[PDB]
C-alpha cells in the first residue's frame, strides 16, 4: 500500500472497496501455515510478492479476500517506525511477519 | 652518573634514533618470518656522561627474539587466478584508453583468498608490493557509520534525535535527523561532489588546507530534508560531529581524527590504519597520478554516478602526480589510509558487523534509500539499482562502498551470503569506473547468481488493542 | 573462442500467462595473430571455456530458472594477454511478460599486441515476445533461441530458433518454454570453447 495516495481510516473503511486502486503496489497469494494460540494470536508463514514495480511503499493491509470488492472484508492495517518503506524495482519483497504472531483476537 | 637510556644495535649498526627511556621502545622493521634474531640483536645501557656498556647480545639476556611465521592461506584454483589476472590486465596502461600505471586486487571467499599488485607507481626500478599505503578515500564511510550505529545500539543516541543538538549553526539543523544523516536524506549541498569553484582548487592545489563545515554553514539546502536521497559528505563530516560529542558526554575527548583510527586498529587489527595530518601518507606508498583534463572532465569524475559515465576517453597528452593531498578536503568522509590486507580486513569485520547488535545487524542488512537506477551496460553490471544502507552501497548481494581521493580509486564490497570480500585499488584519477567495472568483473567470475536483484524485507509490527470490556449491574 | 551460456527456463501452471525462458549468449573470438619470443614471457596460460549449464525444471507448478555463463576463455603471458569471454546465461521466464531475457554475447579483450576479434551473438529473449538467436559466421559464436509459452485465456505460443555459426567459439543454449504443471524441459546447455595454439 502506498500510504499518499491512501489514509488510513481505522472506523470507517471495512471493504476492499474502500481502499483506491492507486494505493495498490501489488497483492499477495494467499497466507499458508495459518495458526492459533491460547494467547489470542494468530500466524502466517512470510509472505512474497514476486516481481515487484510500483511506486514506493509504506505499509501494508491483510484483509479476507471473499473475491468479490463488497465483501472483501479488511482484517489490520501494519507499518513500522523503523521499516518506514520499501522502493520497487523488479525485486520481490517478502513480508517476514513477527515471530509470536501478527494479529490478536 | 644517570642513565641517558638505552641503544638497539643490529648486525652493529644502531636501529635506534636516540636514547630510548626505561619505559620506551624501538621496533626493528624489515625482517623476514619465522626466524631467529636473537644472536644478531644487542643492547647497551648509557650514562649522561657518555659512558656505555658492552652490547649484551638478547641470547645472553634470555629473550626469545623470533619473527612470527608466515601465517599460511588456501588460496584460490589455479584457473580462478589466471582468469582474474587477464581482468585486471584489461583495466592497466598498456590497453589502448586504459590510463592506470598499476592496480591492487584482494579476494576472500569461503573456497579461499587471492592478494595481488600490477604495474608500477611510475617509480624507475620498483613494481608494485603488498606492503605499500594507498588512500582508502569514500570507504572510510563504512567506518564512520559503523560507530555512530554503535553509540546508537548504546542508546547514547536516537534515530529521531535533531542535528542542531550535537552542533550549532547548521542549515535546517532542526529537520535533519540521525536517521536522516545515516541514509543520506540529508538536504546539504557537497562541496566536492557539487562546487565546481571548489573542484578546480581541489585539483589545482589538493595541498591547501579547507574549512568544509564552514563551508556548510553558509551552503543553502538543495531539498527539505528526509523528501529526496542524495550522495553527501556533509553528512558523514556531521557523523564525525555527533561523535566527538558522545567522547565529551560518555568516553573520554577525542576528535574523529583521534577515535576513528583507535577503535578501528585496536578492535581488527589494522595496524597500517591511519588518517594523515601530513599531505602524505605512512611510508612506503603508492604514487597517485591524473592525466590533466578540462574542469568538465574532472566534475564527471567527482560527481555522484561517475562510475556509470565512465567514457569520457582520455584524448589529452600531460600528467600530473597525485600523492600530496590534505586531509581537510574529505574530513570523516575520505581520509583513511592503510595497505591492502588491512583494507580486506576491514571488509570483513562489515561483513562480521563488528561493534554491532544482533538486531542492528540484521536492520543494517535490510533499510536502503534510492542512490541510482541505471540501464546495465553489459552482462556483468548488476541488477538496476543501487541504494544507501545504514553503513553501504548495496548492489545485488554485496554491500560496499566506492571512492577516491585525489589520484586513488579504492573500492571494498562483500557478500551478505558468502561472506567473499573483494577489493579493488587504481593508481590514476582516470580509472574511477575502471576500477568498479573490475569489481563487477570479478564478483561475476566467482558468483554470477549474486550479481542479481536483492529481495526487499518488510517488518510489519504487530496489531495490539486493549482488552476493553464493561461491567453490567445486578439490583 | 569463448563457450557459449546455457539457456533459462519458463514457469510451469495449470492456469495464467506462462513465459519462455530467454537463450544464452554465444561466445567472443580472437583470430589467428602472431606473437614472438621477445613479447611472450617465460611461461603460459591457455585457459579452455567450459560449456554454461542450461536452467533446471521448475520442480513444480512455479517459475523456472536462470543458466549459468559459459567459462572465459584466456591466453596470456608476460606483456600480452588475449582473452575471449563466454556467452551470458539465458533469464527465467515467471509470470510476466518482462521475464525470459536472452543473454549478451561475449566481448573479446587484448593487451600487448594489435590483434583483432569479434564479439558472440546475441542470445534470444523469451518473454511475452519469443525470439531466435543471432546467427554469426564472423569467428565468433551464436546465441541459443527464447522459449515459447502459453496465455492465460488461450493456447500457446511457439519460441525462436538457434543462430547458424562457423566460429569454434561456443554456441549459447536454447531457453525453453512456459509450460503445464506437468510439462516443460531442462534448457540447452552452452557449447565448450575452444582454443588452438601453434609454435614455431
Known sequence: IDADDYTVNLTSHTTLANIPSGAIIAVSESLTGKSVTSAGWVKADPTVFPEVTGDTGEAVIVYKHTGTASTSTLLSYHDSPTYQFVIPNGSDIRVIWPTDGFIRF | ?475 | GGAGGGGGSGRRANSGYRYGGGGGGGGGYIDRVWIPRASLGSTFTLIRGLGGAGGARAAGSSNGNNGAPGGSTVFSSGSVSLTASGGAAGVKGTSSSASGSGGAGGTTSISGVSATGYTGGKGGNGGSSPSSGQSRTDGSGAGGGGGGGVRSNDNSFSGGSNGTSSGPAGNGGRGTDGSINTGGSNAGSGGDGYVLIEWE
Not at chain 2, 261 to 267: G, L, M
Not at chain 2, 407 to 434: C, E, K, P, R, W
Request: hydrophobic share 35%; net charge negative; aromatic share 12%.
Open chain 2, 1 to 475: 652518573s644517570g642513565l641517558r637510556g638505552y641503544n638497539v644495535y643490529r648486525n652493529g649498526v644502531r636501529q635506534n634514533t636516540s636514547p630510548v627511556t626505561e619505559l620506551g621502545s624501538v621496533t626493528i622493521t624489515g625482517l623476514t618470518p619465522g626466524t631467529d634474531y636473537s644472536s644478531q640483536i644487542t643492547v647497551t645501557a648509557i650514562d649522561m656522561a657518555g659512558n656505555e656498556s658492552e652490547p649484551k647480545t638478547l641470547a645472553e639476556l634470555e629473550a626469545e627474539a623470533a619473527t612470527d611465521e608466515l601465517s599460511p592461506a588456501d588460496p584460490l584454483a589455479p584457473a580462478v587466478r589466471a582468469q582474474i589476472d587477464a581482468l585486471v590486465a584489461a583495466k592497466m596502461k598498456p590497453t589502448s584508453g586504459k590510463e592506470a600505471d598499476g592496480a591492487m586486487v584482494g579476494i576472500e571467499t569461503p573456497t579461499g583468498s587471492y592478494y595481488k599488485a600490477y604495474g608500477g607507481d611510475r617509480t624507475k626500478n620498483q613494481p608494485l608490493f603488498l606492503e605499500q599505503n594507498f588512500r582508502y578515500g569514500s570507504c572510510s564511510k563504512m567506518a564512520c557509520n559503523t560507530l555512530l550505529l554503535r553509540e546508537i545500539d548504546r542508546g547514547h543516541v536516537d534515530w529521531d534525535d535533531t542535528l542542531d543538538q550535537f552542533i550549532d549553526g547548521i542549515p535546517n539543523g532542526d529537520k535533519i535527523t540521525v536517521r536522516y544523516l545515516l541514509l543520506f536524506q540529508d538536504g546539504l549541498k557537497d562541496w566536492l561532489q557539487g562546487d565546481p569553484a571548489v573542484q578546480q582548487t581541489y585539483f589545482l592545489n589538493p595541498t591547501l588546507n579547507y574549512d568544509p563545515l564552514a563551508y556548510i554553514r553558509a551552503s543553502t539546502p538543495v531539498f527539505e530534508p528526509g523528501t529526496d536521497s542524495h550522495y553527501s559528505n556533509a553528512a558523514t563530516l556531521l557523523m564525525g560531529k555527533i561523535l566527538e560529542w558522545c567522547d565529551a558526554e560518555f568516553y573520554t575527548g577525542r576528535s574523529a581524527r583521534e577515535l576513528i583510527v583507535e577503535e578501528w586498529k585496536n578492535t581488527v587489527g589494522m595496524e597500517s590504519l591511519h588518517w594523515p595530518t601530513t599531505n602524505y601518507m605512512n611510508q612506503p606508498y603508492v604514487r597517485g597520478w591524473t592525466p590533466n583534463m578540462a574542469l568538465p572532465q574532472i566534475q564527471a569524475i567527482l560527481g555522484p554516478f561517475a562510475f556509470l559515465a565512465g567514457l569520457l576517453g582520455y584524448p589529452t597528452s600531460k600528467d600530473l602526480e597525485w600523492t600530496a593531498v590534505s586531509t581537510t578536503w574529505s574530513d570523516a568522509a575520505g581520509s583513511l589510509a592503510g595497505n591492502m590486507e588491512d583494507f580486506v580486513k576491514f571488509g570483513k569485520a562489515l561483513y562480521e558487523g563488528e561493534f554491532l547488535s544482533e538486531e542492528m545487524n540484521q536492520l543494517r542488512k535490510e533499510i536502503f534509500t534510492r542512490y541510482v537506477e541505471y540501464e546495465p551496460a553489459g552482462p556483468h553490471q548488476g541488477p538496476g539499482w543501487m541504494g544507501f544502507g545504514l553503513n553501504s552501497i548495496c548492489w545485488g548481494h554485496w554491500l560496499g562502498w566506492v571512492g577516491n581521493l585525489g589520484g586513488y580509486i579504492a573500492v571494498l564490497f562483500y557478500n551478505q551470503d558468502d561472506g567473499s570480500v573483494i577489493a579493488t585499488m587504481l593508481n590514476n584519477f582516470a580509472g574511477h569506473a575502471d576500477a568498479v567495472d573490475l569489481f563487477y568483473q570479478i564478483a561475476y567470475l566467482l558468483n554470477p547468481e549474486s550479481t542479481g536483484h536483492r529481495d526487499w524485507i518488510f517488518r510489519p509490527d504487530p496489531a495490539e488493542d486493549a482488552d476493553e470490556v464493561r461491567d453490567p449491574t445486578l439490583y
